[PDB]
Ligand binder design. Structure first.
Ligand SMILES: [Zn+2]
Ligand SMILES: [Zn+2]
Ligand SMILES: [Zn+2]
Lengths: 38, 846
């Protein structure tokens, strides 16, 4: 697939992790029981 | 036998029970059991006397009454009194306690040989034993004095308030001493706003001795005149001349100094101390003092007597002799003299047991421990030897200029040891031991710029000090004056400092004009002194009440008349150029009990041409900088604009995010106004702060016939929500439905069902008046199932009772956005729930 040659590891900069995320989760709810919907 | 002791607080009951024991039964008569009427529950005069209860014309018949919820306690007390053989009335020392005792006596009956009146200044074993040994008779004279005061205050309040409603604004109130306190605050406000700060500069000098020590001085004369440069250029010139000149210490002064401890606290002194050291105002100080007294740790906190018992003096002298030792005794007691009119029979506020340290007060909150520490420290200090200081003063001369230093050094500390200063003062430093006629070497010099202080705004404690100086009110009154001036909306307290609302100025001016005798400080003092004469039994209560009432009625009947006849002038308009959003007309500046607002003259035109449009202001808050210290008030005065027509300062309130409005201090006597596109900031409504789901703007709590309802501040969005029982707020009625068959329980109303994202809830039809809400029960929804809208029907299918047979209520699961049913016992959740899972209610543990 990606044909990588090696693996690299380092600390996570906060801007980097925020760049990963597609959104913030702010409330503890998990899934509705009325309709099985998040 | 069994002897019954009736005490006002329950905590006082517990503390006194600690020392009474098994032979005595102590019953806590919470507050005033019997009081003049309050609620509604020549016919005008009849209705007035029925509202007052007091009838001044028919020799002050009083028609006392017993308030809702007191009757249970009255019944219990009566039963215990029938059981008991001797009834002991152990209210607090002051006139309020005597009135409470009289009320108790008169309700229970059997007066002559069945009531003993107990008098103790502290709730301690020796004091209580001495109090019960020889009980006193009920002192009817003090009761009569208290009744006279109460009658005066109700007469003035009820007779004046309709006049102020008619002439000035509905929802005003008045009060005899209250109005005089407001007058004091308003007079200080007028002095402050009149003030025009001058500007003056000062110069500071830095010097080293031949012995290498260092000294700092301040420069105070030029040409043998006072040094006080007016501008920057002058100050710079002075600094130049100083630097060029050569300095010598032409003056060397020295002298011993002694400082005596402060007197033990009277109530006014205790409030001033607690404000200055701990920051407690009046209400917190007196609440904590009352708790400390009821627990038993301090003597009674309503006193104007500095006297101390021989027991107290001997105890504290023993403590000083043992801990500190002979140097701090001193040879004989420190006497302190209270006013000749003071209640010299009372003691000061002191510890009941000097060895009880503040840390040991396991059952007192930390603020009360601090207040006790202050009382203890003062009490110990007052008997100790004076502190000893030695003082040095230096004057140094260069050219046309002389410059000065003063310093003190501290060599015995005895009273200061127990009671240290909050911070070092400017003279709390070490001047080096320069010789007489010494020399000095010079370091670089600093100018400073200053503006004269206006008269300082009252603090709560400094207002109490002013009242104590004039003789308006008494130790028991002060907290009530300080509270009621705020509660009644004439004065506001901010930055721990007193500020006077424009309505307070209007009412003060009207009351001074019409009721000059009532508002004059001397006549208020003379009235208080005459009540004291009554309590002495130097005067007859009814007599002085009649004299007051005759004068008051003369002044009232004059004041009621038309303004051309000479009655109370109306709330006169001041006019400004602004376009009314409804009719474009010029707009004027108006004061109501709600605040200060912008109105359109069409309000004074009959219906045909009437305009009710109004615009609503927010005042600018003064934000005094604590770090500026004494400067903080002066700079506030500097911050204000000044009126064009007069020297009076101006006060500032916004009107738009683009516009800001300045108004003169003597408004409406002065009609100056200013409008600036340099606006600042305006605030809108207020309440429980909520966020509108339809626009994200702030939302606020409002009242009117359809409810205590919650409404958004964005003028483009009339989304509202509402109040309910088991949540902060509830969105608007997704399907509302009335039910005549569910009566309300706290009120006579009927219930109505509603819906929002908070859940589905019951709410009473007269909603702003009733305010009553609760969640529906499943059995209630089953009973009204036919009325339910189509979607709500499943909640009536829900299981009505849990497995234990506890009844069930309907709740919203915010974590899963669905209704469920739950059960409660003793109002607590049973930890059972049932949920809807698509046509099949399913149940279990929470
Ligand atoms: Zn208008
Ligand atoms: Zn003016
Ligand atoms: Zn909105």
């Amino acid at each position: 697939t990606e044909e990588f040659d090696a693996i690299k590891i380092a600390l996570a900069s906060p801007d980097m992790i925020r760049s990963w995320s597609f959104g913030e989760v702010k409330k503890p709810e998990t899934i509705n029981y009325r309709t099985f919907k998040p | 036998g069994k002897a019954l002791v009736i005490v006002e607080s329950p905590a006082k009951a517990k503390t006194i029970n600690k020392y009474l024991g098994s032979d005595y039964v102590v019953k806590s008569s919470v507050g005033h059991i019997r009081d003049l009427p309050t609620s509604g529950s020549k016919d005008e005069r009849g209705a007035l006397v029925n509202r007052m209860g007091v009838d001044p014309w028919h020799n002050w018949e009083a028609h006392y009454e017993v308030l809702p919820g007191k009757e249970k306690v009255v019944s219990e007390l009566k039963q215990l009194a029938e059981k008991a053989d001797h009834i002991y009335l152990a209210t607090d020392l002051d006139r309020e306690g005597e009135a409470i005792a009289w009320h108790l006596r008169e309700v229970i009956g059997g007066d002559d040989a069945r009531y003993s009146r107990v008098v103790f200044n502290e709730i301690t074993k020796n004091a209580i034993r001495q109090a019960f040994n020889k009980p006193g008779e009920l002192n009817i004279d003090r009761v009569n004095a208290q009744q006279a005061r109460r009658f005066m205050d109700r007469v003035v309040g009820y007779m004046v308030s309709p006049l102020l409603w008619k002439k000035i604004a509905r929802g005003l109130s008045a009060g005899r001493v209250q109005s005089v306190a407001v007058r004091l605050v308003v007079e200080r406000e007028r002095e402050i706003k009149a003030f025009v700060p001058e500007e003056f500069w000062e110069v500071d000098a830095s010097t080293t001795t031949p012995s290498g020590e260092a000294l700092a001085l301040q420069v105070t004369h030029q040409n043998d005149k006072p040094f006080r440069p007016v501008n920057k250029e002058q100050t710079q010139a002075a600094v130049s001349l100083l630097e060029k000149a050569r300095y010598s210490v032409l003056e060397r002064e020295d002298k011993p100094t002694t400082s005596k401890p402060g007197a033990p606290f009277i109530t006014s002194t205790l409030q001033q101390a607690a404000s200055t050291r701990l920051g407690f105002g009046v209400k917190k100080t007196m609440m904590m003092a009352q708790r400390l007294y009821e627990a038993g740790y301090i003597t009674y906190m309503r006193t104007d007597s500095t006297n101390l018992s021989q027991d107290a003096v001997n105890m504290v002298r023993g403590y000083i002799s043992d801990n500190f030792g002979k140097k701090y005794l001193p040879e004989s007691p420190n006497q302190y003299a209270s006013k000749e009119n003071s209640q010299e029979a009372h003691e000061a506020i002191r510890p009941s047991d000097v060895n009880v340290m503040a840390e040991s007060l396991k059952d007192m909150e930390a603020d009360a421990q601090k207040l006790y520490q202050l009382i203890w420290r003062q009490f110990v200090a007052c008997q100790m030897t004076p502190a000893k200081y030695d003082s040095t003063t230096l004057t140094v001369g260069a050219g046309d200029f002389r410059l000065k230093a003063r310093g003190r050094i501290l060599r015995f500390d005895g009273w200061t040891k127990v009671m240290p200063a909050l911070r070092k003062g400017d003279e709390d430093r070490i001047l080096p031991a320069v010789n007489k006629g010494d020399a000095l070497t010079l370091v670089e010099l600093t100018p400073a710029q200053h503006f004269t202080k206006p008269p300082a705004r009252f603090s709560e404690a400094s207002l109490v000090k002013e009242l104590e100086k004039r003789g308006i009110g008494r130790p028991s009154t002060y907290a009530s004056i300080i509270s009621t001036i705020q509660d009644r909306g004439y004065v506001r307290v901010e930055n721990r400092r007193f500020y006077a609302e424009k309505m307070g100025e209007i009412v003060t001016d009207r009351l001074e004009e019409n009721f000059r005798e009532l508002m004059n400080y001397d006549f208020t003092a003379q009235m208080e002194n005459s009540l004291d004469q009554v309590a002495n039994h130097e005067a007859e209560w009814k007599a002085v009440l009649d004299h007051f009432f005759s004068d008051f009625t003369q002044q009232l009947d004059k004041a009621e008349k038309d303004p051309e006849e000479g009655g109370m002038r109306p709330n006169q308009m001041v006019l400004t150029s602004i376009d009314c959003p409804t009719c474009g007309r010029k707009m004027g500046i108006r004061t109501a009990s709600t605040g200060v607002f912008l109105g359109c003259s069409g309000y004074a035109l009959p219906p045909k041409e009437r305009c009710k449009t109004t615009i609503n202001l927010v005042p600018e808050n003064e934000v005094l900088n604590v770090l500026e210290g004494e400067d903080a008030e002066t700079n506030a005065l500097r911050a204000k604009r000044r009126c064009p027509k007069c020297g009076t300062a101006m006060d500032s309130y916004l009107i738009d995010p683009k516009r800001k409005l300045h108004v003169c201090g003597n408004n409406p006597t002065c009609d100056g106004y200013e409008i600036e596109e340099g606006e600042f900031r305006i605030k809108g409504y207020d309440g429980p702060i909520v966020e509108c789901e339809k626009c994200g703007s702030e939302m606020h709590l409002k009242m009117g016939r359809f409810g205590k309802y919650m409404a958004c501040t964005n003028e483009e969005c009339k989304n509202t929500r509402k109040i309910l029982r088991n949540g902060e707020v509830a969105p608007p009625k997704e399907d509302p439905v009335p039910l005549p068959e569910l009566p309300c329980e706290k009120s006579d109303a009927y219930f109505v069902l509603r819906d929002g994202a908070a859940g589905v809830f019951l709410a009473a039809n007269t909603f702003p008046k009733s305010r009553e809400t609760r969640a529906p029960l499943v059995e209630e929804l089953y009973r009204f199932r036919d009325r339910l809208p189509e979607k709500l029907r499943y909640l009536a299918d829900a299981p009505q009772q849990d497995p234990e047979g506890n009844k069930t209520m309907v709740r919203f699961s915010r974590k899963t956005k669905q209704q469920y049913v739950s059960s409660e016992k003793d109002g607590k959740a049973t930890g059972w729930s049932a949920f809807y899972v698509d046509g099949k209610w399913v149940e279990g543990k929470k």
